[PDB]
């Protein structure tokens, strides 16, 4: 038994959650239980908290999705069959370079893209405030909101900050499955191969490193779940043989180890650094460095 999937599922009264300082009036009712999810993790769905911020975020998010969708339908000639077969080829493109950073572009030539970006902007940022507040209501630290900022940073750089620094919305990424992939490839081409961007190399190290560390950590906790290992918070407050054996496995393996609390600091940074370095590398592209190969030759 590897404890990857549960052998027997157990179920009791739905958990309504801790109260603390949260406005219980904004908490929904408990959803259904998924036996399917129960094999891997918890079966309980919900409840969810939906205050004003969450409603705003959900609304914008849907509007963003809707804006892209209506454009796609237009591109499909309102024909369901065409919509489906060309779904990955449709693309909501930003304004042409001639429009600079103005909002004067005609709807079908960038305006819809600007509207979509506005909705996504509001959606993402209101959601960020939500990650902060939901934590505040429980008296918890703001680690989630901070980690989220790192992801937001790469996103901000790609569709707002960099386009603005270069005076053109045409520098932003289009909304399309395949098109945003073309944009990515093109971006590297146009900047002299991103494999030469030092910050792209780091970003990759952390992306690979996050898969490395989580394979390591996830496997370690599972390896010591026979000693109640996943109950990490209590292991931090009162170290058990689970924490000791996990530490010693690594100390004996690579010469050094972590603690039950410390490993999560290594974790959050390993992941956060992916988009942190990534964002910097993209921000420098085209604004300070036109060709990374060339830049590389002078460093």
């Amino acid at each position: 038994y590897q404890n990857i999937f549960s052998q027997v599922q157990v179920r009791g009264p739905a958990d309504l959650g801790m109260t603390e300082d949260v406005n219980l009036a904004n908490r929904s009712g408990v959803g259904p239980f998924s036996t399917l999810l129960g094999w891997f993790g918890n079966a309980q769905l919900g409840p969810i908290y939906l205050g004003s911020l969450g409603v705003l975020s959900l609304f914008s998010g849907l509007m963003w999705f809707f804006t892209i969708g209506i454009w796609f339908w237009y591109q499909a000639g309102w024909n369901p069959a065409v919509f489906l077969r060309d779904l990955f080829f449709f693309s909501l493109e930003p304004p042409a370079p001639e429009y600079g950073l103005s909002f004067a572009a005609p709807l079908k030539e960038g305006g819809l893209w600007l509207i979509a970006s506005f909705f996504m902007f509001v959606a993402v940022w209101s959601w960020w405030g939500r990650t902060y507040l939901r934590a505040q209501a429980l008296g918890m630290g703001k680690h989630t909101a901070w980690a989220f900022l790192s992801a937001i940073w790469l996103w901000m750089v790609l569709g707002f900050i960099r386009p603005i620094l270069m005076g053109s919305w045409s520098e932003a990424v289009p909304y399309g499955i395949f098109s945003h992939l073309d944009w990515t490839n093109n971006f590297s081409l146009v900047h002299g191969n991103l494999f030469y961007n030092p910050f792209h190399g780091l970003s990759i190290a952390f992306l690979y490193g996050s898969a490395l560390l989580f394979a390591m950590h996830g496997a370690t906790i599972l390896a010591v779940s026979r000693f109640g290992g996943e109950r990490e918070l209590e292991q931090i407050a009162d170290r058990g043989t689970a924490a000791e054996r996990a530490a010693l496995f690594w100390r004996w393996t690579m010469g050094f180890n972590a603690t039950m609390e410390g490993i999560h600091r290594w974790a959050i940074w390993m992941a956060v650094l992916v988009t942190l370095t990534g964002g910097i590398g993209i921000l420098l592209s085209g604004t300070v460095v036109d060709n990374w190969y060339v830049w590389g030759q002078n460093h």
Binding site: V8, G12, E234, D238, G240, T241, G262, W269
Partner: protein, 246 residues
């Protein structure tokens, strides 16, 4: 060159972060010791971080780390060589003495509490509304040890209420008493519960719990430590795969 200053600065930051992370991961187990218990000469380059204090819920005090090593119980092991870096062999029964892969830690002799201050784990029998929702119900099944002999029967499942999960199987032995078997150390089959880590004769030896309705962290550790220790120390009594196949 801005890009150059940026990358140069990053490495400075990264070295500082790694430094921070490492010291932060020295809140336990340090200072390092010599195999005899005395402070080791080489403590490494990273210095111990300054103390931090965790405020524990429901009158359980506080926890300050780094702090003096808590572990003080007797360790039934003896040096094997004059030089450092060698194994320390058990002086008595490793399973009974709690050493090697049978080790346990002197954790708080109180049950882990949930967010309300209630016991996190509880026999399903007493967990209002809890039931097996999917999979083979192990309750009622005989329990076989690695020697392929029956060691007892499952009389209940101890559940983690907040996480709604099976954490221990309560197994009644021949003498009418019961023991708790870690869920992740058993294999529920259609007609039995198989425990590879232990031979039937070792079940009586599983550490017991004071109260029949709760289990403390100290007890959990002794129990889990003991069971895992069987993989090594019960190997002589563990029958082959082909034998088990018959």
């Amino acid at each position: 060159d801005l890009a150059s200053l940026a990358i140069y600065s990053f490495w400075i930051f990264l070295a500082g972060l790694i430094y921070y992370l490492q010291t932060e991961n020295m809140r336990e187990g340090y200072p390092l010791e010599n195999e005899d218990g005395t402070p080791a000469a080489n403590q490494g380059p990273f210095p111990l971080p300054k103390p931090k204090t965790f405020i524990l819920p429901h009158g359980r005090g506080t926890l300050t780390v780094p702090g003096p090593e808590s572990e003080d119980r007797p360790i039934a092991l003896a040096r094997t060589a004059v030089s450092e870096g060698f194994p320390h062999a058990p002086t008595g029964d490793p399973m009974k003495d709690g050493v090697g892969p049978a080790s346990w830690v002197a954790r708080r002799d109180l049950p882990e509490l949930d967010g309300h201050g209630h016991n996190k784990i509880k026999p399903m029998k007493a967990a209002a509304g809890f039931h097996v929702s999917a999979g083979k119900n192990p309750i009622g099944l005989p329990v076989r040890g690695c020697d392929l002999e029956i060691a007892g029967k499952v009389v209940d499942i101890w559940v983690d209420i907040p996480e709604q999960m099976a954490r221990f199987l309560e197994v009644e032995l021949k003498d009418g008493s019961t023991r708790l078997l870690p869920m992740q150390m058993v294999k529920v089959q259609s007609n039995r519960v198989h425990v590879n880590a232990l031979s039937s004769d070792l079940f009586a030896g599983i550490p017991t719990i004071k109260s029949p309705t709760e289990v403390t962290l100290l007890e959990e550790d002794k129990i889990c430590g003991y069971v895992a220790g069987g993989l090594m120390y019960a190997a002589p009594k563990r029958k082959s795969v082909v034998a088990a196949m018959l």
